[model samples]
Target chain A: QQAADAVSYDDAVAALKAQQFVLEANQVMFRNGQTAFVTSNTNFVLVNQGRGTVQVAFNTVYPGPNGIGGVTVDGTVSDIKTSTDKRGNINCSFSIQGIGISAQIFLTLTNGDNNATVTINPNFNSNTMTLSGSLLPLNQSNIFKGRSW
Target chain B: QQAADAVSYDDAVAALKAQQFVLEANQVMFRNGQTAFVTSNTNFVLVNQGRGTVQVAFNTVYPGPNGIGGVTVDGTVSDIKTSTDKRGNINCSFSIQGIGISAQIFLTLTNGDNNATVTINPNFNSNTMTLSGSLLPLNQSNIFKGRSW
Candidate 1:
């Protein structure tokens, strides 16, 4: 199935190379195999210029401190690398450093679509989390920014 | 990688046909794409004769009322179907009827391995959850039974 307003492959490639894209994840897959469906507007991995932000929010009755159901981490993006697999899937890797959280991120853009999956490897315990959703151009994305650490 | 004592293909095929096996799930994946890593001993799908038991337990401090951080549902199995894909993947589907819960289960045994994935679709709301892990013969499984409803 194709998204009506899905970002095209060429556009996604351009956005990724320019570091100006937002992956609004509608799903969160934990390292332990537990899965949680979340809202795309609140849970996203965004890179604008040289800065990046990662946010996660659950659908809870009461919105937590971040005004969503989860927390937000913003940091400077560094050590960026990009590659492509034989099947033409694009892989982008980077590290985010901030006061509250630091982690390495591996983002894979599926072939021929805006769909992408990201794995966030946190610094503390080597714990990894995954998010799957659409990769949209920064201007085309409809994301909400919550309070960040 | 193959398990040291993984059930052979012939054994698994026979056990599935006879409805005498247990799938000890080490991971649970929700319909929303959220995933949780779990312990096999506490979470499993068991089929003995014509009766079935589906249990799920999280790794938490409190054991909960079920003594496994989750709940159990026991029921009679019906509407069973099995098929093999071109890739040799085995698919098994069945429905369970019990006092507290009723649901349909679709199980897929990966080719050449004891590993399997199951989707439990509830009778109500079409909500579904998935579990993945090893499929073993009843006598070979080492699962813990919690309190059932």
Candidate 2:
């Protein structure tokens, strides 16, 4: 069998973050327009918002033959709340949809001397997951920057 | 901030395994085709086999923006061994790709009457994640045909 290699979450996060501008814009359109954009644009906005609950629902389309089974795991952002710490770090939290399954994650954000944290609680089997993350906006540009959003 | 909930390893395993068939099929096609058979019969053959690994030398295309800094978390599947006791159980070690990370997991077959297990080393600073529940089969028509090779 072939050996498995490492997959980078950081790279994924960075890539996702880089698309923030487009994502936010799309979300504005999606929430108001109720229309679907391109796959990347859709997923990017969903992952951003960084609040509320969304489903990381998994489905395998085309089980066999003509097409290979495809896995689509998607979640939404909910319960978004943002706050500033004594040291001026921005903290936030929202829920993720993990229908019928539970998921929890502790996320740490760091940029130079600035640091922040976020946590996610997923209710496995119930289909509801929540997320919380913090950001230390050392400057105005740093406020809405990065994947932590 | 949304209150985070707790998920068991069983739940995480379930989630991961839920995508196993798709992952395996993707792996098979990726390895055999390697961009050489985008429209060839080999791709079809690999899809039919459906019981192998995808050779994603790099991370799957990021579902995000085009350009941005990225982080790669590489890890290995160490001590991998197939198990017949559970009919189709797969046991393996996911060692840290670089350093300070490690995970062990067991994958049980759909009708194997066995459950999977996953354990992450405490020092690794990984988020507490769990998976459980039954996975939808790739081929519901021939449950006893065994996995395609």
Candidate 3:
């Protein structure tokens, strides 16, 4: 039994990693409230609560004559706002920074275990940000039922 | 939690010895399936199983000039028998010896947590034997419940 005071970061990461078995690589980033910027190697970040946008930048690293060269790829945060609530709830976000990308771009936000919400912006070219979607609190009983010691 | 196999008789004996309550003692002898003698004492053997007639003889212990003389209690049992079926059942017979003018005699047979049978021969004469009325099983649930741990 987990103690009431136990922190669950490892548990969260493990669960997220295990989800890879069922979700494709791209699907995983989307499920985690990440928007693809370059598709492969990417940088993501959690956005502000209630109102703030996230960005994702993806790039390709190439082997150079001397050593490893910098990456070059599309990088943009599809216009999206990210913000947390008064309860210190921050939405998960993803971003990419590379050759074509200059600044962090907005991505999707995901609601975590707690009763939190995240919004995504699908439109990137127009720079128009809107609430793509939101997530709900996970069913605690269902999650616990799937848990094994 | 301790495993069931970890439980020991020494722990049970220590727990029993820790109890401070006083228990009424009774002894009885059986002949032809009838009580032959009866007495009460502060000390009595709790017979769980097996059978043999009890003989009670009482004598006062006296501190003599040389040393303390052992006391003897007078009692008798005749034509007594105890037998168990193939299921490893139990049968018991006992008698009590103590200093008293007149003592009431009772024949009690109990199956511990299961059932009990009691036969009381009231107003036992001093230094005289009395026969229990019947050898009937105490079929009432109350009797067994009373004797349960």
Q: How accurate locally is residue B131 in candidate 3, as Cα lDDT from 0 to 100? A: 21
Which runs in model 1 stand beyond 4 Å of their true positions? A1-149, B1-7, B31-34, B59-71, B144-149
Residues B45-69, model 3: lDDT tens digits: 2221221112233222212221111
Between candidates 1 and 2, the lDDT winner: 1
Instruction: Write candidate 1's Cα lDDT for A1-149 as tens digits.
Output: 45543348767878897889989887766544555677887678889888988876666333343222444678899888776645556766788788967777777775678878776656775445677888877877767334342
- Share of true Cα-Cα contacts across chains kept by each model: 0.03, 0.00, 0.00
lDDT of each: 0.71, 0.27, 0.26
Candidate DockQ values, in order, are 0.04, 0.03, 0.00
- Score candidate 3 by DockQ: 0.00
Q: TM-score for all predictions? A: 0.48, 0.22, 0.17
**Highest DockQ: which candidate?**
1
Best by TM-score: 1
Better of 2 and 3 by DockQ: 2
Task: Give residue A32's lDDT in candidate 2 (0 to 100).
Answer: 12
lDDT of 1 at B139: 69
Judge candidate 1 at residue B141 and give its lDDT. Answer: 71
Deviation from native of the Cα of residue B130 in model 3, angstroms: 96
TM-score of chain A of 1: 0.77
